[PDB]
Design an enzyme around this catalytic site. Sequence first.
Site, PDB file in Angstrom:
ATOM      1  CG  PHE A  58      35.632  33.558  30.103  1.00  0.00           C
ATOM      2  CD1 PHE A  58      34.318  33.682  29.666  1.00  0.00           C
ATOM      3  CD2 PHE A  58      36.642  33.493  29.157  1.00  0.00           C
ATOM      4  CE1 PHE A  58      34.015  33.725  28.311  1.00  0.00           C
ATOM      5  CE2 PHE A  58      36.349  33.538  27.805  1.00  0.00           C
ATOM      6  CZ  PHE A  58      35.030  33.654  27.379  1.00  0.00           C
ATOM      7  CB  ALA A  59      37.648  29.546  35.474  1.00  0.00           C
ATOM      8  CB  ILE A  60      41.409  33.489  32.766  1.00  0.00           C
ATOM      9  CG1 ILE A  60      40.506  33.140  31.575  1.00  0.00           C
ATOM     10  CG2 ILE A  60      42.845  33.788  32.321  1.00  0.00           C
ATOM     11  CD1 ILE A  60      41.094  32.135  30.651  1.00  0.00           C
ATOM     12  CE1 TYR A  63      39.961  37.159  38.913  1.00  0.00           C
ATOM     13  CE2 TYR A  63      37.579  37.033  38.812  1.00  0.00           C
ATOM     14  CZ  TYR A  63      38.731  37.759  39.034  1.00  0.00           C
ATOM     15  OH  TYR A  63      38.668  39.093  39.380  1.00  0.00           O
ATOM     16  CB  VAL A 149      33.788  32.437  37.113  1.00  0.00           C
ATOM     17  CG1 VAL A 149      34.982  33.213  37.684  1.00  0.00           C
ATOM     18  CG2 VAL A 149      33.842  30.979  37.584  1.00  0.00           C
ATOM     19  CG  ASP A 150      33.274  37.391  40.149  1.00  0.00           C
ATOM     20  OD1 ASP A 150      32.701  37.193  39.065  1.00  0.00           O
ATOM     21  OD2 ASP A 150      33.496  38.548  40.580  1.00  0.00           O
ATOM     22  CB  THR A 182      29.028  54.206  35.448  1.00  0.00           C
ATOM     23  OG1 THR A 182      28.657  52.824  35.496  1.00  0.00           O
ATOM     24  CG2 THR A 182      28.824  54.822  36.824  1.00  0.00           C
ATOM     25  CD  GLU A 240      28.865  46.973  33.837  1.00  0.00           C
ATOM     26  OE1 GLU A 240      29.229  47.978  34.486  1.00  0.00           O
ATOM     27  OE2 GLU A 240      28.504  45.912  34.387  1.00  0.00           O
ATOM     28  CG  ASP A 263      27.637  42.341  46.688  1.00  0.00           C
ATOM     29  OD1 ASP A 263      27.403  41.895  47.833  1.00  0.00           O
ATOM     30  OD2 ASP A 263      28.789  42.676  46.325  1.00  0.00           O
TER      31      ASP A 263
END
Lengths: 291, 281
Positions: A58-60, A63, A149-150, A182, A240, A263
């Site tokens: 998704f590139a909304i 993004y 996407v990030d 979480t 999530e 990361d």
Amino acid sequence: VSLPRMVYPQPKVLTPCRKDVLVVTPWLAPIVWEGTFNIDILNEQFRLQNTTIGLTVFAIKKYVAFLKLFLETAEKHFMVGHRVHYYVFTDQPAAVPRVTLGTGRQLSVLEVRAYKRWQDVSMRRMEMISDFCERRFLSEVDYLVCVDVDMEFRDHVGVEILTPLFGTLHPGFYGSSREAFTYERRPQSQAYIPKDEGDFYYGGAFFGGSVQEVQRLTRACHQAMMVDQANGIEAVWHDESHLNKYLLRHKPTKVLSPEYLWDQQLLGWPAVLRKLRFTAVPKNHQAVRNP
Amino acid sequence: SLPRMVYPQPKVLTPCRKDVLVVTPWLAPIVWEGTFNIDILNEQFRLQNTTIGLTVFAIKKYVAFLKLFLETAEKHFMVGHRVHYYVFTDQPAAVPRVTLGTGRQLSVLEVRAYKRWQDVSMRRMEMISDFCERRFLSEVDYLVCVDVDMEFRDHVGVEILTPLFGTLHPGFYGSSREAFTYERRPQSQAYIPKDEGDFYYGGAFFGGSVQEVQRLTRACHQAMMVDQANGIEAVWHDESHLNKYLLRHKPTKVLSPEYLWDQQLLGWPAVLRKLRFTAVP
Ligand SMILES: O=c1ccn([C@@H]2O[C@H](COP(=O)(O)OP(=O)(O)O[C@H]3O[C@H](COCc4ccccc4[N+](=O)O)[C@H](O)[C@H](O)[C@H]3O)[C@@H](O)[C@H]2O)c(=O)[nH]1
Ligand SMILES: O=c1ccn([C@@H]2O[C@H](COP(=O)(O)OP(=O)(O)O)[C@@H](O)[C@H]2O)c(=O)[nH]1
Ligand SMILES: [Mn+2]
Ligand SMILES: [Mn+2]
């Protein structure tokens, strides 16, 4: 048909493939770490039948800026040698960068609404994936891999991940006890998971499976979210949280190690990670999530 | 959808076994005690309402093994689930009267007796395949195919169930592939060269979905018939062909030697936490 003759080292029954990590869940699903698979055997098995892998992203709104690196690196590392169909969900079809694709690979741009709140942009991915399973994916691909996407690919991500249903260990919690997870903890929410339950904390940024199983997952997560919205509640970690509720009660048939979602800035490169395959790119969260 | 269950959290940074390989290089689980939570698996399988077929040949004098085989199977094999025993025999009236638990049934299949024990053993492939078409595809979801001269001593349950499985032969699990007793003559369909092979699977315990078992048994029988035309008989008969087949069609689970053992010949090594299904003298 049959596999052809192949020369490779013999698996040794009295030598564990990893001595430092769990490589199979208690419901006998492989946990995918480097060292647990011979990719040559898997690739050969995968080519026994013509099979196409769909990849949704998704590139909304802002993004779209992540798309160039995402696609260029996927071309280097994602299912190389196999048929790949990219699906880019965007509100800016004209903003999708022209990326050169290897043979047997194609990209389709899917135009969709842009929700105002980033929470809704993230959450509505479940509805949109589910809708498009009906409209397109069922007829076009055999597997779906659904990712943020990030990100960028940095090493091999191949057919070792393919299975009816998979989730990925979240990099922040793989070594954590379940009470520290979480999960949604408010009983009023559909995503609720009690303190004494939970296998793993799966990341919302990387899941997948057959089209049928992904359709089921995404439809279920969307429905649960709508029930919450009707009840005036939004889960603590949005899609999530619902993904985790879903995978708790519907066990994945493979689980991907955090090699597949990492990361390096926050977590470095631990000895337990032999490869860093798919990783976060730097971003300004407050800025990119809002106009 | 599973119900809420309370069990120990799986530990990502703690191997479930440090002494054995628990997944094959093609990502098929190798089933050892400690790799599975049977409560989770039972819940998963009961939600499917699965029927498991078990085939066993009791030809000629081997009817003598049936009583202990069936009694112990009642205590240890798929307890809690639907089971359908198929006894292949040349003597229907010699099958012992063994009382069965609820949801469990036995059918007797009258077949011919071959004179040579090698042929009795080998023709199991033809007979299983034939009956897949006649009975099994309509009646059960999985087939488990075993030797009769055996007894269950501990749990053998849904952890074994998968599209296609073979079992590590207890005599060779720690051997190198060059030492495996594969057929080594290129003249035989069962031929496997010295530089090939993953495991040595035992002829006495295999299974899977009816579809996969039908394919395996048909293939092994065809291979044996080609060999017969070429005036050759594989060194370990049906087992040799089973191994050729499983080399080129990888099983989706491999069972550890916990599932196929002979304590008289091999004792009780530390690596075996349980002896589940064992040879009778
Ligand atoms: O007149 C008949 C004849 C047959 N049947 C039926 O055919 C079946 C097979 O025949 P058998 O059971 O006679 O065949 P086996 O010799 O048991 O042969 C078994 O064990 C061998 C290894 O030994 C084990 C072993 C070897 C080396 C090192 C360690 C070992 N270990 O385990 O520790 C091989 O692995 C064979 O492939 C395997 O089948 C019987 O069970 C009946 O169902 C009848 O009904 N009526
Ligand atoms: O304005 C937005 C917000 C989110 N997303 C999509 O939703 C995913 C999850 O959002 P984000 O990465 O910001 O959340 P994270 O899980 O990293 O905190 C992103 O990767 C994008 O694919 C988007 O396209 N536009
Ligand atoms: Mn992200
Ligand atoms: Mn035997």
